[PDB]
C-alpha cells in the first residue's frame, strides 16, 4: 500500500497544540500591516473567487521588515 505523500516529511506543520494564542484584536493599531498581510495570505485562501473574478494572481509572498519590537 502507498503511504500518503510526504509521510516521513521530517518537517512538521502546526498541530492543535501549537496554535499561537493571539487574535487580530490583540494587536494595537497596525491596520495597514494587518490589511496587507491579510490580503497576501488570508483573503486569497478564504475568498479566492473574489480574486479570480477580477483576474489576479494572489500576491503570494510577503516580507515584513522593521526595527526590533
Amino acid at each position: 500500500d502507498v503511504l500518503p505523500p510526504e509521510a516521513d516529511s521530517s518537517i512538521m506543520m502546526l498541530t492543535s497544540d501549537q496554535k499561537p494564542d493571539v487574535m487580530y484584536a490583540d494587536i494595537g493599531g497596525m491596520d495597514i500591516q494587518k490589511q496587507e498581510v491579510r490580503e497576501a495570505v488570508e483573503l486569497p485562501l478564504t475568498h479566492f473567487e473574489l480574486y479570480k473574478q477580477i483576474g489576479i494572481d494572489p500576491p503570494r509572498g510577503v516580507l515584513m521588515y522593521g526595527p526590533p519590537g
Binding site: 494595537g28 495597514i32 500591516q33 497576501a40 494572489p58 503570494r60 509572498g61 516580507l63 526590533p68
Partner: protein
C-alpha cells in the same frame, strides 16, 4: 566554503519560490530586522511583492497600544496616558509592554493592585533608559 553553502541555501530558496515548477497556494511570509542586506533577487515582485514595513509606533499607534495593554488591568483614576503618548520618544511596542509590565510589578511590590501615576512615571523612566555621559564635544 561556508558562505557559498549559505549562498546555495539562498539560491534554492529563490528557485523554489519562483522557478521552473511554479507553485500554487504556497503563500510565504518572512520577517527580518534589516531589509537592506537582503538579496536583490529575493525582493522581486513575484516572490516578495509586498515588502511591508513595521515602523516604530507613532503618537496614534502609541495611544492604541497603551489602550490595548492597559486593558485587562486595574488602573488609577489619576493616570494621564496622554502625557506618555505625546512625549516624543522612540518607544516601540515591546518597550511599551515593558513599561506596563514593570509598572505592574512595582505596584505589586508596593502592595497595591491599582497602579498610580508615580508607578508609571517610574516605569517610563526605567524603560526610556535615556543614555547619558555622551562625550559632550560631539554636540
Amino acid at each position: 566554503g561556508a558562505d557559498r553553502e549559505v549562498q546555495r541555501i539562498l539560491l534554492e530558496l529563490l528557485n523554489q519560490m519562483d522557478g521552473f515548477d511554479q507553485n500554487v497556494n504556497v503563500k510565504v511570509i518572512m520577517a527580518t530586522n534589516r531589509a537592506d542586506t537582503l538579496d536583490p533577487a529575493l525582493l522581486r515582485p513575484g516572490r516578495l511583492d509586498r515588502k511591508i514595513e513595521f515602523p516604530l509606533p507613532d503618537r496614534r499607534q502609541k495611544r492604541l497600544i497603551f489602550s490595548t495593554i492597559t486593558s485587562k488591568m486595574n488602573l488609577s483614576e489619576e493616570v494621564d496616558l496622554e502625557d506618555y503618548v505625546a512625549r516624543p520618544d522612540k518607544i516601540s511596542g515591546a518597550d511599551i509592554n515593558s513599561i506596563c509590565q514593570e509598572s505592574g510589578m512595582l505596584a505589586v511590590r508596593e502592595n497595591r493592585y491599582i497602579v498610580l501615576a508615580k508607578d508609571f512615571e517610574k516605569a517610563y523612566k526605567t524603560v526610556i533608559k535615556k543614555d547619558e555621559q555622551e562625550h559632550e564635544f560631539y554636540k
